[PDB]
Design a protein around this ligand. Structure first.
Ligand SMILES: O=C(O)CNC(=O)C(=O)O
Ligand SMILES: [Mg+2]
Ligand code: NI
Ligand SMILES: [Zn+2]
Length: 331
């Protein structure tokens, strides 16, 4: 078996190998990359997502989210308080202000220490889940707006045509902005490109060990656990690397820098934080190996997790037994 210790692998495709997305994902998996739950792909040196980022300031963040923490430094939840709309220009100015800017630090490790020590005492503002793309329409390789759709994948594998579309989202981050522990909707893959700015640190649990993370989460967030049998779908719980180590949860960490792709694999729990002002783009995707994960994905039916139009069809076709109850939560 390749990559038996489930280490995060880093890939360096040639421009030639960068031409066929599906084939390269399949190549990564042949080398065991999926075992980690997360891989990094450094694009060929000749590749660019677009010519410049000079004209992005007028993108609107219609609902910036202030991420308010509760709990203890290593074990907390976060809630999103909706803020008034602002442009990316305004947001970047806010990110750079004395109140929100990245503190002085030695290196990524020092900044990670300061994150876990101090996150809970600040409420950074996250421009998340903004439908759109920063890829130039003339970028032909690994253009997150031109991937094949999950609906087409299901049709090709399963022969059923379904409604739904699949489009990317932009994330504008600042220091301490945080993504809670989660897998993707329907345990899909995700791909994330860091277009610009400061890094993003990721933590990930190997898919083969996800249930160990879930078990610890139920012990650490016991009221959440009683409220819903899949509360990590709410995307609100944080658990520090220290706490995961204390409880013997296998995980890995890696820092993504501007110009790099990350791929999360089905049922790879991940969480992380942004180092400073940045802009990422991400989209879910599927492969034939995903199908079985989609069939087994947990679902939130308590009504908190409230997800996209397109997830309906996935649950309807892959999880017909769940469908009724899950849709009661959706409506
Ligand atoms: O970048 C973020 O804030 C969160 N991104 C992801 O969870 C992802 O790409 O799967
Ligand atoms: Mg603009
Ligand atoms: Ni994710
Ligand atoms: Zn729920």
């Amino acid at each position: 078996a390749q990559n038996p210790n489930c280490n995060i692998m880093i890939f360096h495709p040639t421009k030639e190998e960068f031409n066929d997305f599906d084939k390269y994902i399949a190549y990564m998996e042949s080398q065991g990359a999926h075992r980690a739950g997360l891989a990094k792909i450094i694009p060929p040196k000749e590749w660019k997502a677009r010519e410049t980022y000079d004209n992005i300031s007028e993108i609107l963040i219609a609902t910036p989210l202030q991420q308010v923490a509760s709990g203890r430094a290593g074990v907390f939840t976060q809630y999103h308080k909706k803020k008034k709309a602002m442009t990316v220009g305004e947001y970047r100015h806010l990110a750079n202000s004395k109140k929100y800017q990245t503190p002085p630090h030695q290196n990524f490790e020092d900044l990670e220490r300061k994150y876990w020590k101090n996150r809970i005492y600040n409420s950074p503002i996250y421009g998340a889940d903004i439908s759109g793309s920063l890829f130039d329409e003339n970028t032909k390789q690994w253009n997150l707006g031109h991937l094949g759709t999950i609906q087409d994948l299901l049709e090709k594998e399963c022969g059923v045509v379904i409604e739904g579309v699949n489009t990317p989202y932009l994330y504008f981050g600042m220091w301490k902005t945080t993504f809670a522990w989660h897998t993707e909707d329907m345990d899909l893959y995700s791909i994330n490109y860091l277009h610009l700015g400061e890094p993003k640190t990721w933590y990930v649990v190997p898919p083969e060990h996800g249930q160990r993370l879930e078990r610890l989460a139920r012990e650490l967030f016991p009221g959440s656990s009683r409220g819903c049998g899949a509360f990590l779908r709410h995307k609100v719980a944080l658990i520090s690397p220290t706490v995961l180590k204390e409880n013997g949860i296998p995980f890995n960490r890696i820092t993504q820098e501007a110009g790099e792709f990350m791929v999360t694999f089905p049922y790879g729990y991940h969480a992380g934080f942004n180092h400073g002002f940045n802009c990422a783009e991400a989209i879910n995707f599927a492969t034939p190996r995903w199908i079985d994960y989609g069939k087994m994905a947990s679902q939130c039916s308590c009504g908190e997790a409230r997800v996209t139009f397109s997830m309906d069809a996935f649950v309807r076709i892959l999880q017909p037994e769940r469908y009724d109850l899950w849709k009661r939560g959706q409506d």
